């Protein structure tokens, strides 16, 4: 790989974005390699949890069209992974970088994390879920504000609003995340995949139907 | 009843879970008696609000299958109650106990409350809404984390994330809760049932349709 | 206008509710003028962002009881009480910021939630006390509150009528920003000017895409968003 | 039961509405006893398929407390399959009961309709919902607004019923279908019914996922 | 009006599209006048049912600013019922207008289609949405992709229309239906139409709750 | 390919199922080759419309599971194709073969066509959309009947119920289908993809939202 680093240590695959010259901004090559790295991790029977991270400075600072379906296949590639993916976010996670963090299953971030959707500054909009996942996760006011004004959201507000699960000091981010990934790697792999799928039903079906789906999956784990 | 205590005063039915040796864990008998007590309260024209609580130590610490539809009819019994149900949560509300609290209309909890969904530790998953209600109420990151790692959530995080409405000191929990229940009992019973049903549409229909439902129900109160 | 004031400056239409004797309670006249003013702002190519505010004491302290009294079911159903007014606000394609100070209660809380986002002062108090009158929220208080802040707090507010202060509103996601009372309008007009600096097509597209979040499954919302993103080319 | 007859043979429960002098109009007693007999059939390990029918003249010709709520919910919660064998009139609540069943076999004399509008009310047990989803907006709007009847051949052509047979073959056709269903795996049959019913509650993409997960669990 | 004719008689408003030289094709002015006439009929306490029709030759043969949005919203907001009486061509915009009405009665000369693909665009007023939901994926996909026509017999067989009658009976059949609707409670008629239209917006379980609550309020 | 034949002529890719001794039953090899042929047709800028057909006798007469997601990847490969696919059905289209015909964008069939879902006879159910697409396309009674009893549906009933668009004599099936495919090949490729995508929204979103999506796609075709 030329834009990412992949390390497999004791059932956890760690994928580190590696474009320091561009503060880990997404591009065609990085997105292509990331999806490949994720697909290899999914097919690797030893991998039980995935972690995506960037640098202390930036998780990822930013990033015809209809026939090529720009941004479609990459989003699909990540969403198809059945194993869990934790985003470990330090510093900037902006634009596509914020959207990548929200596509992961949950976020653990450092107290320096800064989130934002500044696409409007370029005359376009979020194109990988910034108008959709942000709103569902943190509520209309904050998502509308962020998407319309481009304002940033700090780690404390991110935790307070439900964008992230845990905030820890920058020096403890990787320790917190790998401990969580290890703990997930201790669980039944079938149950882990079922949990992820059931949780993700929450944004696709009426609650009454999501309860039925959950109960049938629960019963099948017997 | 053998596993619960029921007291009706001033239009409030207080249902207390009473399995102290199991820390109020939900079993067949308790769920069966709980549903019966709720149905009696629904059919009791003197009851205007229901409260469910456990002990100071635990609200509730935890909880063939296809043909018997394990956990289906119990959940449906609780969800069909039209009168409002407040959960007064002290100490542990884990697994099925967390799920019961989330099935109530809102939660008031003490500062000692601890929530969690540790079903994954047994190779199964939440089977009474833990993957559905938790996600919809507090957002993807915290619900994914809780369901995948089994981590607990303390009272302060529960209020900050929207899982509970109010947190009060341990010694004020029942005073705070009963005063809320008595405020509800002062209101029109028809309007209270309409309120609860309208709010619950929020997780079943698109917003445009929920707005139409609310307005038609509002009009019917004339 | 009799009950509101409209001032356009730097591509921002500021609409100020002006029934101070009544703490800016909504009534038939105010709602009619408000919707007219929003439609004018929508058709005004000078306007790129809208701001609604009340007084320092009250954004809007409720809805006038006379809007509902003296009416039968046939009246309110055949007339579709509160339907046209809500639809008139929701159809506006330009963004609307609510600058909330003091009381935003009942219909006034619902108005703030129909806006695209809220900036409030640290004196703001929100609530849905309709249940105190034997009725319920009729302009989205049972729907938007629940979806934005979660079931527990919405159920509690709609059933008990309890208030929510500015700090809890921000912590629960009801509002985007809380500032001191002295900076409320400066914070809000600066955000509105920032929005007015952007492409008007992209701004309307952002607002429409965000609002899909409450109408379609996420998978379909993602498809809609990507097709609109692509159409901006 | 005073108003219904229940007969169990070859793992099929035949439930006959027994108010023929009222053309099997659904009153409080019939509806209560119908739900009770359905619940008994569900809890009866010998029953694997259910059939509901009325008389040759009428399947069922018309009809805080949540009026009509509990009855509809009681029918909808039955997990075993229910076939409606419809002869003659199926009107109002009777048409709605037929549509609540999993599918309809009807005789060529069957007549469907929703004439609730004639009384100043509307369908209150699914006539505005199931009819529209099953046969399309034009015919459902027309039936609900004008009260017009739909005959057996139009019912099959529009998808309201699955099969039309001569009046003298109705029970033979239906009991043969029901007996065949009752020979199948009970778990798979309940799974089939549940998956099919997802079609009206979830987006197709999600219904596909549900169906595939249920299919897999049958392993 | 310059593009339409409006006649009110015996509680029925008849709106006739009148662009003979364009075979009643929809344009800015016609849609503007149609919405205005519909809104006047909504506000006219004398009108209880609306009918839209064109000529014997054509119902309607075709068609930042949100092109085609506000007019569609204006038609969809009408609470009183609207019957489309379709003779001859109902194509493109004209097929979409007919589907936006509450139900269709058509002559045996009616011809439906969505030929927008021929111009390098697509249906823009519901032809990809209502057609599919009313008649099924296969025929809607075929019609929208190939531009093929659908005759009156196929329209009734597939559920696109409620009734097909001879050309000379179209207006009599339609005005009789409109008169029957005008005999009913206006509150119940508005409720019925709104309940039926829930069928395409909510899960069935929720549509049933909505219907039951509106039914109960009609007391 | 070993189980299918693929021929591109005049912007139409004809894919013929070719397991005649098995009456074109779907197996792992055929589904793998079919998906490959579809993806190649999608990436082939000369292809504007796809046709799938079998033999005169049968289109297709029939055909660990959770971790491998049995039948998921195959269904998803067919559904992601953006160009249109016509099913030309003669003779038997049963089980997985009926489901394959329903996954295509529309069906033209001969008067000898026979459809059915006999999975229930094996103790399983439809696992590739037979419980979902059949019901949505032709109504609850006929779908419930077919799925519970395994009864066949003949060509006339298929057209009458909306399962197929057109029925023609056996000798005219391929002529009718290729002429339809040529008509589609004459159209704008971007508008053809938009039509198919807009039509398919009909089964995923509320009608009001599908109208919004349709109008925005219509506008962008400018």
Author numbering:
A (entry chain C), B (entry chain B), F (entry chain D): 3 to 65, 77 to 235
C (entry chain A): 3 to 235
D (entry chain E), E (entry chain F): 3 to 65, 80 to 235
Manuscript excerpt for this entry:
In acrylate metabolism and detoxification, AcuH is functional in both the AcuN-AcuK pathway and the PrpE-AcuI pathway. It can catalyze acryloyl-CoA hydration in the AcuN-AcuK pathway and the branching of the PrpE-AcuI pathway. Conserved domain analysis suggests that RdAcuH belongs to the crotonase superfamily (1.07e-74) and is predicted as an enoyl-CoA hydratase (6.64e-150). The activity assay results showed that RdAcuH has acryloyl-CoA hydratase activity and can catalyze acryloyl-CoA to 3-HP-CoA.
With the enoyl-CoA hydratase from R. norvegicus as a model, the structure of RdAcuH was solved at the resolution of 1.9 Å. The overall structure of RdAcuH is a dimer of trimers in an asymmetric unit of the crystal, in which three monomers associate end to end to form a tight trimer, and two trimers associate back to back to form a dimmer. Thus, the dimer should result from crystal packing. Each RdAcuH subunit contains two domains, an N-terminal domain (NTD) and a C-terminal domain (CTD). The NTD adopts a typical spiral crotonase fold which is organized by two perpendicular β-sheets. There are three active centers in each trimer and each active center is located between the NTD of a subunit and the CTD of the neighboring subunit. Because RdAcuH and the enoyl-CoA hydratase from R. norvegicus have high similarity in their sequences and structures, we found that the corresponding residues of these two glutamates in RdAcuH are Glu112 and Glu132 according to the sequence and structure alignment. Biochemical analysis showed that mutations on each of the glutamates to alanine resulted in the inactivation of RdAcuH. Like the enoyl-CoA hydratase from R. norvegicus, there should be a water molecule in the position of the acetic acid molecule that acts as a catalytic water, and the carboxylates of Glu112 and Glu132 are expected to be ionized under a neutral condition.
